[PDB]
Symmetry: D2
């Protein structure tokens, strides 16, 4: 562990990725607000991901918090899932140091074409969403920050739902979200995911959701949220931090 | 109401549409499988639509039937709504005669670029879908026939759902629908509707659904399904006629 | 030759296509007005294509006719190439019999989802275009008939131009083409082609052109034009390939 | 003139734009790399544009230089036009102060969602392209800098060509442009322009060109090239500055 994680990851990335291949991924990240790291574009060693998935499975069994609400700041889109707060995930030494790894952040900076600053709100650095029932979903929303590295730790079959639908090049107006109006004006990109996949999401300008589960399954994702230069010194508004506080102002039943 | 509907509709369409403007609509029908007749592109007189809605409102109050199921031939997509069967709507002399009007079918033939044939199954000539509860939806599906003229008689606010999402240039494999896999590989066109709107839908090659209602509202449409030349002599399979039979095998 | 072509092509296609995978090509054909037949999806055996190309190279060396005009029926788009008339290509029994093959038409009918009828005008059944100079191009245009199977016999590198740009879901108004206005309203699909490729084109409802050659190269195609039930009244006086002095042809 | 330009433009823009409507223009500028200021979305008063045009028409009649070459850094795409160099346009007092106007840059910063810095190379600050012959065109290319405010001063009829064809979400590789391979992979957006139009262009990540003139006409633009935070401290490369030096290293006739 320790610095060997950064050293092994730096070797793990130098075997598959070049500046030219990263520049092609950067063009896709701007066009879609989304790039996927699957079997043909792996991001972390399989042993490292297994250690992260085992850490998340332990945090879930210890700190599972069921959520079933609607967020008024996002057009009353539902939040039907179980979550693990950011303060509980920070206690994991593996997830915390990896989220601030100068190797992982520096490499992904070539895809975002801008600095990836790990300075966000202490209640939003990390988030684990655990969907396991029918109609569980992460409704249409944006992100308060610019970037998010989501770990598709557990993915149900595609025929069972759970895909990530996205609409890039949008914005979040918490007083007038216009989610259904944006769908009428813009085409929706549906991104299928499999267990083990990772993907970078430009969360501030991509209206995105997860297709609700069509039956009882299991959908687990670890969220690593990072801020850009535009997110610094900005005031957090909305009173809609539903994951940390289930009784937030914007959180309705 | 009498045989003067065709004479008035022919004048109604001649006042608004030319062969060149219809050709522009025919291009939009092939690219999206969908052409909307909204406030700026009316299809029928408002007094004719009012008489159609009043006939449908009476059919709903007399013959509405709740449906709550999933269709295995469409990837187990839900069908949560109330329906009025085709044999009941056929009793309406206004709806039945208008659905075979040589003026209406001859005009829409310029958009479909082929003959519109009013010779479909007797259980699918007409259909009224009436949603009014939260999560009510017409799930992802295709149509056994090519064409369908849908009357957006009543639509909730856009913020309450009920929009039509469509994926053109697809096909229906009842043994392997591949609905969620098609979504991952194809962009979804969401089409907002308003009360009074009408739209022509290429139902056989456009995967379409209605966005579920986010809360209790009211969503009423009338479906006039017609056949193309490709649909004649074709045998119906799937055992999935859920609207006519709520216990349809599929 | 003989009837062994249809027997060989039927076994060739039966080993590469299922009704389900053909239905996937039908969706792409209605969506893009274009379906390419490259190495991943071959259409004819390499021996059949070689005999066809050799016949086309002979027809070019014997009856090549240079064209350099503008067609007013398509917004004065240029036509700079060499052509071979359908009446000369129809002399080749191979190209003629293959164009009416029930196995070939029956298979491609599963992509168009409608009958492919080989009953078109006698001056438009076949066409060979041979571009070899800089700025040679087949300008923006439509087709008077619905279908066309183009044989990308010889293609220059993509850096020398020659790609097929297409805009599907359009129509041809010979009195008001509105090509540049259509380009401003729609996206352009550029389809790269390599030597040996084939592709089906929905010519009546797809505005298409070939990118002009950026330098002296060699671009050769063989056009196999068919008709649907829609095409069973030719107007415009713009048949430039058969008549270089058409009323719509300018300079 | 003088300081009255900023006070008149502030008002002109305060009556035709809201923060909510500029955000809608920001979404379009990110999705297409291009946003047009036409009759329904004017940017400058008609009296200011008339003075800007009259200045450019004088700079053309005095310092126009013909160009007819191919740029090897952009796949040998042609440059058939007449140009006025940046140092000559810099002599105009009106164009110089307007390009650095804190009101114009501040308003357009809401569309780019990032600071617009008027600190670019002294040979690429401004540029006027003047096409008037058949086959004249500004071939497929990218921009060394991020932003460019282009003034469609005189546009021929659309049937005579001259539209702006763009492909957003790309990047410039001077050693391997892959212009024709990018077109085969991406859809082209054609943007028709009329005389009097203005448009913002994300020049660094949008592969764009001008459709060649189908006949002898007149096509005149004014380029106001600006930089972002990413363009600062970056070394210029390629030796392909054809507009300033017709005999550049990457310039071939
Ligand atoms: N803001 C999103 C969730 C982001 C939290 C994860 N960092 C929502 O309200 O649904
Ligand atoms: N195929 C439709 C039913 C058609 C009835 C209306 N023409 C469905 O699965 O919902
Ligand atoms: N109509 C086409 C020519 C067709 C040649 C035979 N398929 C044109 O305008 O160029
Ligand atoms: N890079 C451009 C020139 C830009 C000049 C000022 N924007 C070209 O190759 O034509
Ligand atoms: Cl987010
Ligand atoms: Cl249907
Ligand atoms: Cl053609
Ligand atoms: V053609």
């Amino acid at each position: 562990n320790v610095e060997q994680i950064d050293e092994n990851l730096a070797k793990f990335l130098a075997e598959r990725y070049t500046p030219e291949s990263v520049a092609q991924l950067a063009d896709r990240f701007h066009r879609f607000g989304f790039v996927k790291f699957d079997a043909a574009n792996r991001l972390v060693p399989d042993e490292l991901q297994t250690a992260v998935r085992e850490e998340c499975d332990l945090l879930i069994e210890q700190h599972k918090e069921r959520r079933n609400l609607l967020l008024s700041t996002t057009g009353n889109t539902p939040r039907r899932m179980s979550v693990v707060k950011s303060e509980e995930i920070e206690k994991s030494e593996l997830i915390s140091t990896l989220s601030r790894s100068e190797v992982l952040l520096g490499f992904l900076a070539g895809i975002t074409r801008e600095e990836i600053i790990p300075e966000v709100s202490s209640d939003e650095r990390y988030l684990i969403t655990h969907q396991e029932f029918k109609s569980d979903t992460h409704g249409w929303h944006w992100g308060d920050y610019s970037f998010a590295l989501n770990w598709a730790l557990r993915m149900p079959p595609i025929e069972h739902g759970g895909m990530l639908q996205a609409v890039p090049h949008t914005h979040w107006d918490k007083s007038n979200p216009r989610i259904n109006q944006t769908l009428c004006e813009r085409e929706i990109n549906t991104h299928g995911l499999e267990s083990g996949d990772l993907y970078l999401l430009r969360t501030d300008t991509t209206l995105h959701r997860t297709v609700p589960l069509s039956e009882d399954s299991t959908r687990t994702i670890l969220n690593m949220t990072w801020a850009a230069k535009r997110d610094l010194e900005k005031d957090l508004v909305g009173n809609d931090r539903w994951w940390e506080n289930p009784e937030a102002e914007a959180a309705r039943a």
